[PDB]
Amino acid sequence: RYPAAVDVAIVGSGPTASAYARILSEEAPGATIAMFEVGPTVSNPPGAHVKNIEDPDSRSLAQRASEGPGAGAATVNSPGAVKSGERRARPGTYLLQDGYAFPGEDGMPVAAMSSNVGGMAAHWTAACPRPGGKERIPFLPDLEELLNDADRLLGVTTHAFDGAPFSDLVRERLAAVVDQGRTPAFRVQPMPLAVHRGALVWSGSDVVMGEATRDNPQFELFDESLVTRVLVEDGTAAGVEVQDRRSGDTYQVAARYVVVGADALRTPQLLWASGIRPDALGRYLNDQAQVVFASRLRDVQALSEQSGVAWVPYTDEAPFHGQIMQLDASPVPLADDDPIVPGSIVGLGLFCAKDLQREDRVAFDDDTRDSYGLPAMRIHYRLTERDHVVLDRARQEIVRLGKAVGEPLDERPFVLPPGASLHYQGTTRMGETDDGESVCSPDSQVWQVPGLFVAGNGVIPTATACNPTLTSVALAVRGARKIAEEITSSLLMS
Numbered sequence: 001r002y003p004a005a006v007d008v009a010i011v012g013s014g015p016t017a018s019a020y021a022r023i024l025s026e027e028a029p030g031a032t033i034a035m036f037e038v039g040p041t042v043s044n045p046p047g048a049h050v051k052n053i054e055d056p057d058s059r060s061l062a063q064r065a066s067e068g069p070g071a072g073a074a075t076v077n078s079p080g081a082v083k084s085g086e087r088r089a090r091p092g093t094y095l096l097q098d099g100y101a102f103p104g105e106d107g108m109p110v111a112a113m114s115s116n117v118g119g120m121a122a123h124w125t126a127a128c129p130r131p132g133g134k135e136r137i138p139f140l141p142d143l144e145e146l147l148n149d150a151d152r153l154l155g156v157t158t159h160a161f162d163g164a165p166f167s168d169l170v171r172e173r174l175a176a177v178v179d180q181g182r183t184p185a186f187r188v189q190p191m192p193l194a195v196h197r198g199a200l201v202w203s204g205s206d207v208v209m210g211e212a213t214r215d216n217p218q219f220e221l222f223d224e225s226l227v228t229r230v231l232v233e234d235g236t237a238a239g240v241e242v243q244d245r246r247s248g249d250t251y252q253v254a255a256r257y258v259v260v261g262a263d264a265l266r267t268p269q270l271l272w273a274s275g276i277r278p279d280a281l282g283r284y285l286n287d288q289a290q291v292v293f294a295s296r297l298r299d300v301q302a303l304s305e306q307s308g309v310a311w312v313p314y315t316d317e318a319p320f321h322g323q324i325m326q327l328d329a330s331p332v333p334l335a336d337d338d339p340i341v342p343g344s345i346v347g348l349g350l351f352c353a354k355d356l357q358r359e360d361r362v363a364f365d366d367d368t369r370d371s372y373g374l375p376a377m378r379i380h381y382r383l384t385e386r387d388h389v390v391l392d393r394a395r396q397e398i399v400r401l402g403k404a405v406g407e408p409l410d411e412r413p414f415v416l417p418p419g420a421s422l423h424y425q426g427t428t429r430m431g432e433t434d435d436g437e438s439v440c441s442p443d444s445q446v447w448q449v450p451g452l453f454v455a456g457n458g459v460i461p462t463a464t465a466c467n468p469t470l471t472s473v474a475l476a477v478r479g480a481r482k483i484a485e486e487i488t489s490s491l492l493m494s
């Protein structure tokens with residue numbers, strides 16, 4: 001099934017692994033690439049968003065097939081289920097069965113993963129804000145350029161709701177309580193969204209791979225392919241061990257470059273199982289503390305055009321990221337729509353930047369194996385005093401914003417359990433030097449293994465509140481360009 005050797009082997013098929021495939025297809029066109037995804041193909045073109053599947057029954061099946069071992073488990077698909085705090089995953093995702101919490105620690109009880117072609121971007125709500133202040137990685141002089149390139153790969157736009165009736169009204173009402181003393185980049189503005197188009201549809205990994213990857217004769221995608229090991233020969237990346245889930249057969253695929261984009265929890269898991277264990281691996285894990293709310297606007301009368309998505313930017317002084325959105329553009333069900341006046345109800349979400357700690361980590365136990373046969377995950381996570389103060393300010397701020405747009409549907413703001421944001425950073429984080437605090441270089445290349453590159457939210461080292469996918473793709477673009485420059489300028493061959 002698999003080639004004996006390739007130039008680049010890519011683990012996973014989410015937007016960050018898809019970014020490597022795209023830039024390598026554009027900038028190193030002759031290079032052979034094999035992408036391996038453990039989950040099945042659930043959409044067309046491969047990795048497309050499940051919400052673009054018109055048939056609801058076929059859409060439910062695509063979501064169920066994405067839930068790995070939690071396929072036959074009850075999910076959270078209503079605002080009542082979110083507020084009930086039941087330890088369930090949202091459709092298209094699955095939770096850990098054990099090792100999510102430990103005594104004297106908060107853990108991440110609702111830490112979720114997706115197993116399908118396209119990763120979580122086959123199920124996401126495409127908010128693509130830019131980082132600001134201390135969120136920006138300071139040692140990347142080209143950060144702005146890479147963020148603009150990430151906008152290109154995701155097809156990001158801030159004008160999809162320029163025809164929506166309530167988008168300008170929500171924006172101007174939030175601006176009255178947010179904008180005072182802020183420079184233009186930190187004022188209330190439309191959220192940049194990864195939305196395609198024939199009505200406005202969500203963008204998945206299919207948009208990031210694009211026609212450049214799909215028309216590349218040298219690229220091949222293998223679904224139902226579990227990468228169990230990253231192979232190392234002479235201290236450099238040598239290939240991948242891959243279990244063909246359609247037969248149980250385990251193969252070895254040789255490669256000059258190995259790119260792991262397997263999400264923030266499974267990327268350090270695969271490195272740990274391969275014997276690639278630097279001291280910073282899986283440490284400085286950070287979730288974005290999340291608070292939710294809902295509000296009804298004060299007026300009369302697949303993706304709908306109601307009020308769009310408003311962005312309340314993070315600042316160092318007010319370290320949370322806000323998003324005010326129409327109910328179908330929310331990462332979590334927040335309210336039912338108003339029957340008489342539709343589009344008049346908006347959801348509110350605040351996400352907190354974390355107080356980075358070395359002891360917040362994802363650890364692995366070789367004595368216990370998970371549903372895929374890999375070392376089980378142990379999550380050690382705890383909110384500090386500073387984290388609780390910031391989360392308290394976020395609960396106050398979300399009420400201020402909710403009252404500013406209208407009449408709040410709920411009396412109190414609701415904090416979601418740790419893991420709810422689905423934005424886990426820092427587990428394979430980049431740094432300037434190999435001091436024992438970072439796993440990879442500014443080009444996302446693992447310090448310990450030349451040729452081995454990491455991808456995803458785990459790469460982000462800073463304390464961020466904003467939705468991470470756009471930044472993670474921007475970092476993937478820099479890593480993929482280092483690979484393309486090395487391949488195109490090498491005297492060596494395949």
Ligand SMILES: Cc1cc2nc3c(=O)[nH]c(=O)nc-3n(C[C@H](O)[C@H](O)[C@H](O)COP(=O)(O)OP(=O)(O)OC[C@H]3O[C@@H](n4cnc5c(N)ncnc54)[C@H](O)[C@@H]3O)c2cc1C
Nearest residue numbers: 012014015016038115119120125126127227262456467469
């Ligand atoms: C409901 C929802 C709403 C969201 N909304 C937003 C939003 O508005 N904005 C935002 O920025 N983020 C949002 N997210 C999060 C976003 O989807 C992720 O940040 C993003 O998908 C991460 O990209 P990734 O490529 O690093 O990893 P993933 O998307 O998680 O993909 C990793 C892939 O690797 C595969 N894989 C893992 N281990 C192996 C292995 N050993 N072998 C082979 N394959 C493997 C997995 O099956 C998976 O498909 C949302 C997510 C959900 C589900």
